[PDB]
Design a protein around this motif. Structure first.
Motif, PDB file in Angstrom:
ATOM      1  N   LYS A 263     -10.450  -7.519   7.762  1.00 37.84           N
ATOM      2  CA  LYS A 263      -9.632  -6.399   7.325  1.00 37.84           C
ATOM      3  C   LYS A 263     -10.231  -5.969   5.997  1.00 37.84           C
ATOM      4  O   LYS A 263     -10.352  -6.776   5.085  1.00 37.84           O
ATOM      5  CB  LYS A 263      -8.160  -6.815   7.190  1.00 37.84           C
ATOM      6  CG  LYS A 263      -7.197  -5.707   6.805  1.00 37.84           C
ATOM      7  CD  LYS A 263      -5.788  -6.265   6.477  1.00 37.84           C
ATOM      8  CE  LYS A 263      -5.030  -6.830   7.682  1.00 37.84           C
ATOM      9  NZ  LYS A 263      -4.607  -5.746   8.589  1.00 37.84           N
TER      10      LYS A 263
ATOM     11  N   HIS B 157      -0.868   3.579  -0.319  1.00 46.34           N
ATOM     12  CA  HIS B 157       0.521   3.365  -0.716  1.00 46.34           C
ATOM     13  C   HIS B 157       0.705   2.178  -1.671  1.00 46.34           C
ATOM     14  O   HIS B 157      -0.151   1.279  -1.743  1.00 46.34           O
ATOM     15  CB  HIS B 157       1.382   3.131   0.506  1.00 46.34           C
ATOM     16  CG  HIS B 157       1.128   1.813   1.142  1.00 46.34           C
ATOM     17  ND1 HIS B 157      -0.004   1.563   1.892  1.00 46.34           N
ATOM     18  CD2 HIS B 157       1.845   0.665   1.136  1.00 46.34           C
ATOM     19  CE1 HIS B 157       0.027   0.312   2.312  1.00 46.34           C
ATOM     20  NE2 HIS B 157       1.144  -0.252   1.883  1.00 46.34           N
TER      21      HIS B 157
ATOM     22  N   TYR C 222      -2.251   0.123  17.318  1.00 48.41           N
ATOM     23  CA  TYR C 222      -2.057  -0.861  16.273  1.00 48.41           C
ATOM     24  C   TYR C 222      -0.772  -1.609  16.588  1.00 48.41           C
ATOM     25  O   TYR C 222       0.283  -0.993  16.783  1.00 48.41           O
ATOM     26  CB  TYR C 222      -1.984  -0.179  14.891  1.00 48.41           C
ATOM     27  CG  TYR C 222      -2.164  -1.079  13.674  1.00 48.41           C
ATOM     28  CD1 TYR C 222      -2.823  -2.294  13.778  1.00 48.41           C
ATOM     29  CD2 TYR C 222      -1.793  -0.655  12.413  1.00 48.41           C
ATOM     30  CE1 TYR C 222      -3.032  -3.103  12.685  1.00 48.41           C
ATOM     31  CE2 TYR C 222      -2.010  -1.459  11.293  1.00 48.41           C
ATOM     32  CZ  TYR C 222      -2.633  -2.676  11.433  1.00 48.41           C
ATOM     33  OH  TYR C 222      -2.862  -3.480  10.332  1.00 48.41           O
TER      34      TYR C 222
ATOM     35  N   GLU D  18       3.904  -0.791  -2.519  1.00 45.43           N
ATOM     36  CA  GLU D  18       4.952  -1.395  -1.705  1.00 45.43           C
ATOM     37  C   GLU D  18       6.286  -0.686  -1.917  1.00 45.43           C
ATOM     38  O   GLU D  18       6.450   0.057  -2.900  1.00 45.43           O
ATOM     39  CB  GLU D  18       5.080  -2.872  -2.021  1.00 45.43           C
ATOM     40  CG  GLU D  18       3.785  -3.641  -1.793  1.00 45.43           C
ATOM     41  CD  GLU D  18       3.246  -3.432  -0.394  1.00 45.43           C
ATOM     42  OE1 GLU D  18       3.999  -3.633   0.586  1.00 45.43           O
ATOM     43  OE2 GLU D  18       2.072  -3.036  -0.288  1.00 45.43           O
TER      44      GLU D  18
HETATM   45  O1  LIG Z   1      -1.849  -4.936   7.650  1.00 38.69           O
HETATM   46  C1  LIG Z   1      -1.804  -3.656   7.354  1.00 38.69           C
HETATM   47  O2  LIG Z   1      -2.092  -2.752   8.146  1.00 38.69           O
HETATM   48  C2  LIG Z   1      -1.356  -3.356   5.979  1.00 38.69           C
HETATM   49  C3  LIG Z   1      -1.051  -4.336   5.161  1.00 38.69           C
HETATM   50  C4  LIG Z   1      -0.572  -4.148   3.778  1.00 38.69           C
HETATM   51  O3  LIG Z   1      -0.401  -3.015   3.305  1.00 38.69           O
HETATM   52  O4  LIG Z   1      -0.313  -5.271   3.127  1.00 38.69           O
END
Ligand SMILES: O=C(O)/C=C/C(=O)O
Ligand SMILES: [Mn+2]
Ligand SMILES: [Zn+2]
Length: 351
Positions: free
Chosen positions: A203, A185, A129, A187
Protein backbone atom coordinates in the motif's frame (compact mmCIF):
# COMPACT_ATOMS: atom_id res chain seq x y z
CA UNK A 1 13.22 22.44 21.38
CA UNK A 2 10.61 20.49 19.41
CA UNK A 3 11.08 22.64 16.30
CA UNK A 4 14.53 21.05 16.14
CA UNK A 5 13.37 17.41 15.80
CA UNK A 6 12.47 16.31 12.25
CA UNK A 7 12.90 19.86 10.89
CA UNK A 8 12.38 18.31 7.47
CA UNK A 9 9.04 16.81 8.57
CA UNK A 10 9.99 13.66 6.66
CA UNK A 11 8.21 10.34 7.07
CA UNK A 12 10.07 8.22 9.65
CA UNK A 13 10.40 4.51 10.17
CA UNK A 14 10.73 2.86 13.57
CA UNK A 15 11.87 -0.56 14.66
CA UNK A 16 10.77 -1.02 18.26
CA UNK A 17 12.00 -3.92 20.35
CA UNK A 18 9.40 -6.23 21.84
CA UNK A 19 9.69 -4.47 25.23
CA UNK A 20 8.92 -1.16 23.53
CA UNK A 21 6.12 -2.66 21.47
CA UNK A 22 4.17 -3.75 24.57
CA UNK A 23 2.81 -0.34 25.59
CA UNK A 24 0.95 1.39 22.78
CA UNK A 25 0.39 4.91 24.09
CA UNK A 26 3.97 4.98 25.36
CA UNK A 27 5.55 4.26 21.99
CA UNK A 28 3.22 6.70 20.20
CA UNK A 29 4.42 9.25 22.73
CA UNK A 30 8.03 8.20 22.02
CA UNK A 31 7.89 8.54 18.24
CA UNK A 32 6.36 12.01 18.78
CA UNK A 33 9.29 12.80 21.06
CA UNK A 34 11.41 11.97 17.98
CA UNK A 35 9.34 14.38 15.81
CA UNK A 36 7.52 11.69 13.79
CA UNK A 37 4.26 13.58 13.96
CA UNK A 38 5.62 16.56 12.04
CA UNK A 39 5.43 14.47 8.87
CA UNK A 40 1.75 13.51 9.47
CA UNK A 41 2.64 9.89 8.90
CA UNK A 42 5.03 7.30 10.36
CA UNK A 43 5.85 3.67 9.68
CA UNK A 44 6.33 1.27 12.53
CA UNK A 45 7.93 -2.05 11.81
CA UNK A 46 6.87 -4.58 14.46
CA UNK A 47 9.27 -7.17 15.96
CA UNK A 48 9.61 -10.26 13.74
CA UNK A 49 8.59 -12.58 16.60
CA UNK A 50 5.27 -10.77 16.88
CA UNK A 51 2.25 -11.90 14.88
CA UNK A 52 -1.46 -10.88 15.14
CA UNK A 53 -2.89 -14.06 13.61
CA UNK A 54 -1.44 -17.55 13.11
CA UNK A 55 -2.74 -17.95 9.55
CA UNK A 56 -4.90 -16.17 6.99
CA UNK A 57 -6.76 -19.17 5.60
CA UNK A 58 -10.15 -19.09 7.27
CA UNK A 59 -10.95 -15.94 5.50
CA UNK A 60 -11.88 -16.99 1.97
CA UNK A 61 -15.47 -17.30 3.20
CA UNK A 62 -15.59 -13.93 4.99
CA UNK A 63 -18.24 -11.63 3.52
CA UNK A 64 -17.66 -8.14 2.07
CA UNK A 65 -21.20 -6.77 2.29
CA UNK A 66 -20.55 -3.44 0.55
CA UNK A 67 -17.87 -3.78 -2.11
CA UNK A 68 -17.21 -0.52 -3.92
CA UNK A 69 -16.41 0.06 -7.57
CA UNK A 70 -14.18 3.15 -7.82
CA UNK A 71 -14.83 5.34 -10.81
CA UNK A 72 -12.40 8.16 -11.24
CA UNK A 73 -12.92 11.24 -13.38
CA UNK A 74 -10.39 13.98 -14.04
CA UNK A 75 -7.17 14.91 -15.84
CA UNK A 76 -3.92 16.78 -15.26
CA UNK A 77 -3.37 15.36 -11.78
CA UNK A 78 -6.81 16.36 -10.43
CA UNK A 79 -9.54 13.76 -10.03
CA UNK A 80 -12.88 13.12 -8.31
CA UNK A 81 -13.63 9.56 -7.32
CA UNK A 82 -17.21 8.27 -7.33
CA UNK A 83 -18.43 5.16 -5.53
CA UNK A 84 -20.60 2.49 -7.10
CA UNK A 85 -21.69 -0.08 -4.57
CA UNK A 86 -21.55 -3.60 -5.93
CA UNK A 87 -23.52 -6.53 -4.47
CA UNK A 88 -21.98 -8.49 -1.59
CA UNK A 89 -19.23 -11.05 -2.16
CA UNK A 90 -16.76 -13.31 -0.38
CA UNK A 91 -13.06 -12.74 0.11
CA UNK A 92 -12.38 -15.64 -2.21
CA UNK A 93 -14.70 -14.10 -4.83
CA UNK A 94 -12.87 -10.81 -4.43
CA UNK A 95 -9.41 -12.35 -4.87
CA UNK A 96 -10.55 -14.09 -8.08
CA UNK A 97 -11.67 -10.79 -9.57
CA UNK A 98 -8.53 -9.15 -8.15
CA UNK A 99 -5.94 -11.55 -9.50
CA UNK A 100 -7.87 -11.72 -12.75
CA UNK A 101 -5.91 -10.70 -15.86
CA UNK A 102 -8.32 -7.80 -16.23
CA UNK A 103 -7.69 -6.29 -12.77
CA UNK A 104 -4.22 -7.49 -11.74
CA UNK A 105 -1.00 -5.60 -11.14
CA UNK A 106 0.89 -4.60 -14.27
CA UNK A 107 4.56 -5.59 -14.67
CA UNK A 108 7.23 -3.07 -13.66
CA UNK A 109 10.82 -2.57 -12.47
CA UNK A 110 11.31 0.30 -10.00
CA UNK A 111 8.42 1.55 -7.82
CA UNK A 112 8.57 4.93 -9.52
CA UNK A 113 7.24 3.10 -12.60
CA UNK A 114 4.23 1.47 -10.91
CA UNK A 115 3.46 4.93 -9.45
CA UNK A 116 3.60 6.44 -12.94
CA UNK A 117 1.23 3.74 -14.20
CA UNK A 118 -1.21 4.37 -11.38
CA UNK A 119 -1.44 8.13 -12.13
CA UNK A 120 -1.73 7.40 -15.84
CA UNK A 121 -4.45 4.72 -15.72
CA UNK A 122 -6.37 5.96 -12.70
CA UNK A 123 -9.54 6.72 -14.63
CA UNK A 124 -9.51 3.47 -16.69
CA UNK A 125 -10.97 0.05 -15.89
CA UNK A 126 -12.47 0.96 -12.47
CA UNK A 127 -11.49 -1.58 -9.74
CA UNK A 128 -13.44 -2.86 -6.76
CA UNK A 129 -12.39 -2.14 -3.18
CA UNK A 130 -13.39 -4.35 -0.25
CA UNK A 131 -13.61 -1.32 1.98
CA UNK A 132 -15.05 -0.45 5.38
CA UNK A 133 -15.59 -4.03 6.44
CA UNK A 134 -16.49 -4.33 10.12
CA UNK A 135 -14.19 -6.76 11.87
CA UNK A 136 -10.69 -7.60 13.01
CA UNK A 137 -8.18 -10.24 11.96
CA UNK A 138 -6.44 -10.26 15.36
CA UNK A 139 -6.22 -13.41 17.48
CA UNK A 140 -8.18 -12.72 20.70
CA UNK A 141 -5.14 -12.84 22.98
CA UNK A 142 -2.71 -10.53 21.17
CA UNK A 143 -2.21 -7.71 23.72
CA UNK A 144 0.21 -5.66 21.67
CA UNK A 145 -1.05 -3.11 19.16
CA UNK A 146 -4.43 -4.77 18.97
CA UNK A 147 -6.51 -2.46 16.77
CA UNK A 148 -9.56 -3.84 18.56
CA UNK A 149 -8.55 -2.58 22.02
CA UNK A 150 -5.64 -0.12 22.02
CA UNK A 151 -6.93 1.46 25.29
CA UNK A 152 -6.36 5.13 24.46
CA UNK A 153 -8.44 7.99 25.77
CA UNK A 154 -10.60 7.76 22.61
CA UNK A 155 -12.28 5.06 24.76
CA UNK A 156 -13.86 7.89 26.74
CA UNK A 157 -16.44 8.16 23.97
CA UNK A 158 -17.88 4.66 24.40
CA UNK A 159 -17.23 4.62 28.17
CA UNK A 160 -19.13 7.83 28.71
CA UNK A 161 -22.02 7.62 26.23
CA UNK A 162 -22.27 4.02 24.95
CA UNK A 163 -21.74 5.30 21.38
CA UNK A 164 -19.79 3.38 18.78
CA UNK A 165 -18.73 4.89 15.48
CA UNK A 166 -17.80 2.20 12.98
CA UNK A 167 -14.18 2.37 11.89
CA UNK A 168 -13.43 5.15 14.37
CA UNK A 169 -13.61 3.37 17.73
CA UNK A 170 -14.20 -0.05 16.08
CA UNK A 171 -11.97 -1.86 13.54
CA UNK A 172 -12.36 -1.84 9.75
CA UNK A 173 -10.93 -4.23 7.22
CA UNK A 174 -9.89 -3.13 3.73
CA UNK A 175 -9.47 -5.68 0.93
CA UNK A 176 -7.78 -4.03 -2.00
CA UNK A 177 -6.69 -4.76 -5.55
CA UNK A 178 -4.47 -2.90 -8.00
CA UNK A 179 -5.33 0.75 -8.59
CA UNK A 180 -7.75 1.00 -5.62
CA UNK A 181 -7.37 4.40 -4.00
CA UNK A 182 -7.91 6.35 -0.81
CA UNK A 183 -8.42 10.06 -1.47
CA UNK A 184 -6.79 13.01 0.33
CA UNK A 185 -8.09 13.51 3.86
CA UNK A 186 -7.49 13.86 7.58
CA UNK A 187 -9.21 11.56 10.05
CA UNK A 188 -12.66 12.21 11.47
CA UNK A 189 -12.39 14.85 14.23
CA UNK A 190 -8.76 15.09 13.08
CA UNK A 191 -7.93 11.96 15.10
CA UNK A 192 -4.96 9.61 14.79
CA UNK A 193 -5.18 6.41 12.85
CA UNK A 194 -3.43 3.07 12.90
CA UNK A 195 -3.23 0.85 9.80
CA UNK A 196 -1.93 -2.71 9.74
CA UNK A 197 -1.42 -4.52 6.45
CA UNK A 198 -2.14 -8.18 7.25
CA UNK A 199 -1.09 -9.55 3.84
CA UNK A 200 -0.73 -9.06 0.11
CA UNK A 201 0.82 -6.48 -2.15
CA UNK A 202 1.98 -3.14 -0.76
CA UNK A 203 0.00 0.00 0.00
CA UNK A 204 1.67 3.24 -1.01
CA UNK A 205 1.08 6.49 0.90
CA UNK A 206 1.46 10.21 0.30
CA UNK A 207 1.41 12.69 3.17
CA UNK A 208 1.37 16.43 3.81
CA UNK A 209 2.80 17.75 7.15
CA UNK A 210 0.13 19.08 9.54
CA UNK A 211 2.02 22.38 9.61
CA UNK A 212 1.38 22.68 5.86
CA UNK A 213 -2.15 21.22 5.94
CA UNK A 214 -3.71 24.62 5.43
CA UNK A 215 -1.72 25.13 2.21
CA UNK A 216 -3.10 21.89 0.76
CA UNK A 217 -6.66 23.01 1.61
CA UNK A 218 -6.14 26.39 -0.08
CA UNK A 219 -5.01 24.56 -3.18
CA UNK A 220 -7.95 22.15 -2.97
CA UNK A 221 -10.47 25.01 -2.64
CA UNK A 222 -8.92 26.72 -5.68
CA UNK A 223 -9.07 23.61 -7.80
CA UNK A 224 -12.59 22.65 -6.69
CA UNK A 225 -14.45 25.93 -6.07
CA UNK A 226 -17.94 24.46 -6.46
CA UNK A 227 -17.34 21.76 -3.85
CA UNK A 228 -15.70 24.36 -1.60
CA UNK A 229 -18.80 26.58 -1.80
CA UNK A 230 -21.11 23.65 -0.87
CA UNK A 231 -19.22 22.19 2.06
CA UNK A 232 -16.89 23.72 4.61
CA UNK A 233 -14.72 20.58 4.57
CA UNK A 234 -15.32 18.84 1.24
CA UNK A 235 -12.07 16.84 1.42
CA UNK A 236 -13.74 14.84 4.18
CA UNK A 237 -16.03 13.37 1.48
CA UNK A 238 -12.87 11.35 0.53
CA UNK A 239 -13.51 11.83 -3.21
CA UNK A 240 -10.55 14.05 -4.09
CA UNK A 241 -7.37 12.73 -5.65
CA UNK A 242 -4.37 14.95 -6.32
CA UNK A 243 -1.15 13.72 -7.93
CA UNK A 244 2.29 14.32 -6.39
CA UNK A 245 3.29 16.25 -9.54
CA UNK A 246 0.42 18.63 -8.90
CA UNK A 247 1.45 19.11 -5.28
CA UNK A 248 4.98 19.64 -6.45
CA UNK A 249 3.83 22.13 -9.08
CA UNK A 250 2.14 24.31 -6.45
CA UNK A 251 4.84 24.07 -3.78
CA UNK A 252 2.98 21.86 -1.32
CA UNK A 253 5.46 19.91 0.78
CA UNK A 254 4.75 16.19 0.96
CA UNK A 255 6.39 12.79 1.40
CA UNK A 256 5.90 9.24 0.07
CA UNK A 257 6.18 5.90 1.74
CA UNK A 258 5.27 2.40 0.65
CA UNK A 259 3.78 0.11 3.27
CA UNK A 260 4.75 -3.58 3.11
CA UNK A 261 2.75 -6.54 4.44
CA UNK A 262 3.26 -6.90 8.19
CA UNK A 263 3.96 -3.20 8.63
CA UNK A 264 2.05 -0.55 10.62
CA UNK A 265 1.30 3.02 9.53
CA UNK A 266 0.35 5.77 11.96
CA UNK A 267 -1.33 8.94 10.77
CA UNK A 268 -1.31 11.95 13.08
CA UNK A 269 -3.83 14.73 13.88
CA UNK A 270 -4.44 16.97 10.87
CA UNK A 271 -2.10 14.87 8.75
CA UNK A 272 -3.46 14.84 5.21
CA UNK A 273 -2.77 11.53 3.44
CA UNK A 274 -3.77 9.55 0.37
CA UNK A 275 -2.58 6.52 -1.55
CA UNK A 276 -3.29 3.33 -3.47
CA UNK A 277 -2.92 -0.42 -3.26
CA UNK A 278 -0.52 -2.39 -5.46
CA UNK A 279 -2.65 -5.49 -5.78
CA UNK A 280 -4.66 -7.95 -3.75
CA UNK A 281 -4.02 -7.14 -0.07
CA UNK A 282 -5.77 -6.76 3.23
CA UNK A 283 -5.60 -3.92 5.74
CA UNK A 284 -7.06 -3.20 9.15
CA UNK A 285 -7.55 0.24 10.74
CA UNK A 286 -9.18 2.32 13.46
CA UNK A 287 -8.76 5.78 15.00
CA UNK A 288 -7.25 6.52 18.41
CA UNK A 289 -6.32 9.52 20.52
CA UNK A 290 -3.69 11.10 22.77
CA UNK A 291 -4.05 14.17 25.03
CA UNK A 292 -2.55 16.28 22.27
CA UNK A 293 -5.46 15.34 20.02
CA UNK A 294 -8.00 17.07 22.24
CA UNK A 295 -7.20 20.57 21.00
CA UNK A 296 -7.36 19.34 17.41
CA UNK A 297 -10.69 17.71 18.28
CA UNK A 298 -11.99 21.03 19.57
CA UNK A 299 -10.93 22.88 16.43
CA UNK A 300 -11.61 20.35 13.66
CA UNK A 301 -13.62 21.82 10.78
CA UNK A 302 -16.30 19.26 10.00
CA UNK A 303 -18.30 18.45 6.89
CA UNK A 304 -21.35 20.70 6.82
CA UNK A 305 -23.48 19.08 4.12
CA UNK A 306 -24.20 15.51 5.23
CA UNK A 307 -26.20 14.40 8.29
CA UNK A 308 -24.31 11.12 8.16
CA UNK A 309 -20.97 12.71 9.15
CA UNK A 310 -19.06 11.72 12.29
CA UNK A 311 -19.22 14.23 15.11
CA UNK A 312 -17.75 13.46 18.50
CA UNK A 313 -18.80 15.52 21.52
CA UNK A 314 -15.62 17.10 22.90
CA UNK A 315 -17.28 18.02 26.19
CA UNK A 316 -16.02 15.03 28.16
CA UNK A 317 -12.43 15.52 27.01
CA UNK A 318 -12.36 19.20 27.92
CA UNK A 319 -13.75 18.56 31.42
CA UNK A 320 -11.39 15.74 32.25
CA UNK A 321 -8.21 17.10 30.65
CA UNK A 322 -8.66 20.87 30.33
CA UNK A 323 -10.83 21.70 33.36
CA UNK A 324 -9.47 25.25 33.70
CA UNK A 325 -10.59 26.03 30.16
CA UNK A 326 -14.05 24.43 30.19
CA UNK A 327 -16.07 27.51 31.13
CA UNK A 328 -13.99 29.55 28.68
CA UNK A 329 -14.43 27.01 25.89
CA UNK A 330 -18.18 26.70 26.51
CA UNK A 331 -18.46 30.48 26.31
CA UNK A 332 -16.62 30.44 22.96
CA UNK A 333 -13.70 32.44 24.33
CA UNK A 334 -11.00 29.75 24.22
CA UNK A 335 -8.63 31.09 21.57
CA UNK A 336 -5.88 28.52 22.11
CA UNK A 337 -3.67 28.30 19.03
CA UNK A 338 -2.31 24.93 17.91
CA UNK A 339 1.44 24.22 17.58
CA UNK A 340 1.76 21.29 15.17
CA UNK A 341 5.44 20.76 16.15
CA UNK A 342 4.85 20.07 19.87
CA UNK A 343 4.71 16.37 20.96
CA UNK A 344 1.90 14.98 23.16
CA UNK A 345 2.45 15.67 26.93
CA UNK A 346 2.67 11.90 27.77
CA UNK A 347 6.16 11.93 26.23
CA UNK A 348 7.38 13.83 29.30
CA UNK A 349 8.76 10.40 30.14
CA UNK A 350 11.19 10.74 27.18
CA UNK A 351 11.43 14.56 26.59
O1 LIG B 1 -6.86 1.56 3.66
C1 LIG B 1 -7.26 2.63 3.02
O2 LIG B 1 -7.77 2.61 1.89
C2 LIG B 1 -7.09 3.90 3.76
C3 LIG B 1 -6.55 3.88 4.96
C4 LIG B 1 -6.35 5.08 5.79
O3 LIG B 1 -6.71 6.20 5.41
O4 LIG B 1 -5.80 4.85 6.97
MN1 LIG C 1 -7.11 7.98 6.79
ZN1 LIG D 1 -19.66 17.91 3.24
Amino acid sequence: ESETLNPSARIMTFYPTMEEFRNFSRYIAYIESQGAHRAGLAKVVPPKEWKPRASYDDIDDLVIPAPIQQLVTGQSGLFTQYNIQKKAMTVREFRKIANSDKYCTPRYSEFEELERKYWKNLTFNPPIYGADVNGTLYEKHVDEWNIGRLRTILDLVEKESGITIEGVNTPYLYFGMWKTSFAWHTEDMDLYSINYLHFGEPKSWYSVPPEHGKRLERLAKGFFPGSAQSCEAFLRHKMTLISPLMLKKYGIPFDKVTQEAGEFMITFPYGYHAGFNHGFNCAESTNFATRRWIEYGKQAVLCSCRKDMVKISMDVFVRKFQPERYKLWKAGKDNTVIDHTLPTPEAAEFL
